[PDB]
Amino acid sequence: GEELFTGVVPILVELDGDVNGHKFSVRGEGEGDATIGKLTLKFISTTGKLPVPWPTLVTTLLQCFARYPDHMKQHDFFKSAMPEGYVQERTISFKDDGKYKTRAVVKFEGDTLVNRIELKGTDFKEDGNILGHKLEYNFNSENVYITADKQKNGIKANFTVRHNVEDGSVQLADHYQQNTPIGDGPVLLPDNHYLSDQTVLSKDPNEKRDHMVLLEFVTAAGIT
Numbered sequence: 001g002e003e004l005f006t007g008v009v010p011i012l013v014e015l016d017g018d019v020n021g022h023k024f025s026v027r028g029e030g031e032g033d034a035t036i037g038k039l040t041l042k043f044i045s046t047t048g049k050l051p052v053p054w055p056t057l058v059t060t061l062l063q064c065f066a067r068y069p070d071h072m073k074q075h076d077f078f079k080s081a082m083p084e085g086y087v088q089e090r091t092i093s094f095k096d097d098g099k100y101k102t103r104a105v106v107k108f109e110g111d112t113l114v115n116r117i118e119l120k121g122t123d124f125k126e127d128g129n130i131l132g133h134k135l136e137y138n139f140n141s142e143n144v145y146i147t148a149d150k151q152k153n154g155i156k157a158n159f160t161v162r163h164n165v166e167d168g169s170v171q172l173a174d175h176y177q178q179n180t181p182i183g184d185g186p187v188l189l190p191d192n193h194y195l196s197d198q199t200v201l202s203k204d205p206n207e208k209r210d211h212m213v214l215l216e217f218v219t220a221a222g223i224t
Contacts, residue, residue, distance in 0.1 A: 036217070056135065
């Protein structure tokens with residue numbers, strides 16, 4: 001499982017979604033280098049303009065590319081699930097607004113790591129930050145705390161994203177996360193640790209479609 005990640009791995013991401021009715025589709029491509037925890041990706045809304053702000057989709061749009069230091073490598077559930085992969089499910093509650101429920105299947109197809117995502121959002125207020133598009137095109141990166149869940153055979157994460165709003169306010173996004181492997185063989189289950197995230201969003205000056213360029217560095221830490 002960890003042997004699949006010794007080099008650069010091409011990535012394909014495919015997202016289908018609906019939010020308060022507004023359907024859309026997102027396709028992403030790039031590569032991951034788990035030796036340095038580096039993801040480089042580019043995502044396009046193939047259905048036209050994205051009805052939600054891009055920063056709201058960043059956590060949904062490959063934690064198997066986190067760099068786990070050598071003294072932590074027996075805590076890396078994401079790569080242990082490979083190649084059969086894992087199901088990643090989240091509930092993303094927005095304060096004073098709606099919530100995203102996502103379900104993702106992350107596995108290898110040949111040499112390409114593929115993430116297939118379904119997203120559904122409900123109870124969104126059309127004048128509020130999300131549908132209003134009142135959020136800034138940036139990202140505040142923080143730590144993801146991971147705990148093992150031996151009974152359900154997987155892991156859980158719980159974090160809160162703080163989205164800057166164009167008026168100086170902050171729109172919070174409470175994430176609950178569950179990952180569960182697809183194959184039947186045993187997987188590594190970790191002691192409590194965290195993933196440290198560094199995220200940079202940009203734009204591709206020649207890309208005419210609604211998109212997002214994403215550079216991420218992800219490192220496990222919290223065990224000495």
